[PDB]
């Protein structure tokens, strides 16, 4: 999408795999503010918005907190306390053709600067003077949008670049966007420090003879004590015996 | 802008109390050794204040 009409994809209720991104070698800019891409796998968020748009190379610096310019003011603006990520990579092979691709536009005039995550797709004739334009172009009456000169032979600064801004949200709602948090192998009949889906402990895991129900996950003793669990990956029930101990 | 004052931006672990780290080693953000060479996932640890 164009910078003046940047698209916004909403991500919710899914496993957010950030490894494929920060380890990929196809991204020129992968900036992040107040948050590490690796730590995201350990975090959950209510919603994650990927704002996508194309801008020329030298305008890629405007996508950041405390930035000014055509893109920063009239097309796309970020807050001074942004805590997401900004990713950008060249798209000269995709967003350029012999003759000049003009399908990507940008807002050139506006009566005021944009607000954080504000989208203006209006095509009203800009009134540069005191004479109302009344939807007619002319002197002091210009079209607010203008095309980009994306050609294969253009300079890197003027060549197209695809940009995605990842913003995270935490409402009064459940966090449905979590990381994968890859597991480990399982060891039985030993004192180990185990961490299952939502619980942790220290004990000995043994093949059990109990019969959990299909929806039952972790068992309990009489004194609200965890005695058995169900392995999330393999539907095998494990008894938990406390690690051997006693007075000396 | 005065850029003489710096701050460390990357470190493999948090500092212990009253610890002092003045190293300029290249920070290995990925699995590839940097061998003192900056680049992808190889960043200079310090950065200046504006």
């Amino acid at each position: 999408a164009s910078v003046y009409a940047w698209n916004r994809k909403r991500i919710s209720n899914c496993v957010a795999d950030y490894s494929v991104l920060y380890n990929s070698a196809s991204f020129s800019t992968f900036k992040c503010y107040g948050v590490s891409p690796t730590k995201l796998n350990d975090l959950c968020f209510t919603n994650v918005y990927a704002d996508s748009f194309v801008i020329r190379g030298d305008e890629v610096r405007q996508i950041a907190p405390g930035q000014t310019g055509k893109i920063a003011d009239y097309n796309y603006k970020l807050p001074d306390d942004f805590t997401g990520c900004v990713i950008a990579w060249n798209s000269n092979n995709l967003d350029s053709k012999v003759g000049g691709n003009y399908n990507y536009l940008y807002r050139l005039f506006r009566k005021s600067n944009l607000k954080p995550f504000e989208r203006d797709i209006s095509t009203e004739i800009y009134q540069a003077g005191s004479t109302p334009c009344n939807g007619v172009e002319g002197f002091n009456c210009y079209f607010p949008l203008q095309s980009y000169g994306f050609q294969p032979t253009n300079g890197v600064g003027y060549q197209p670049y695809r940009v995605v801004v990842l913003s995270f949200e935490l409402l009064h709602a459940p966090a449905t966007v979590c990381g994968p948090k890859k597991s480990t192998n399982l060891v039985k009949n030993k004192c180990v420090n185990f961490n299952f889906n939502g619980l942790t402990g220290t004990g000995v895991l043994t093949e059990s003879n109990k019969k959990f129900l299909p929806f039952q996950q972790f068992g309990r003793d009489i004194a609200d004590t965890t005695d058995a669990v169900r392995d999330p990956q393999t539907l095998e029930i494990l008894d938990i015996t406390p690690c051997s101990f006693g007075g000396v | 802008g005065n850029y003489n004052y710096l701050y460390r931006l990357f470190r493999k672990s948090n500092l212990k109390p009253f610890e002092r780290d003045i190293s300029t080693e290249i920070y290995q953000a990925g699995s590839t050794p940097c061998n003192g060479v900056e680049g992808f996932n190889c960043y200079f640890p310090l950065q200046s204040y504006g």
Partner: nanobody
Amino acid sequence: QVQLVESGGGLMQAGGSLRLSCAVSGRTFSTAAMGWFRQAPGKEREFVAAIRWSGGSAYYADSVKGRFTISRDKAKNTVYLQMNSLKYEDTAVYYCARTENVRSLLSDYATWPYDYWGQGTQVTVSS
């Protein structure tokens, strides 16, 4: 005052090599990086190379990768640009700039501004 002085420019035949030198006098400890730019008549000044003063890590423009090499002598407070495989397209005035802004990402020096600039030296590649 911080003074940058370029030298080494001159006439060369295409395919040769030339080492441009740039000496810095005045402030030394505050040097964060040294960059080489070039500008041809009627053309915009363009980034050629950059080198971090500490560590010596270098960042090169794609147009000169494999031909130009940027190095620096801290004891002499000098920065050198060895231009190999000289081309007619290399004919331009080469300037050296100094920055005291330490940036974690080296590539930032390919676009961030420089506060000090030398007078430049002409290089001409005839054939």
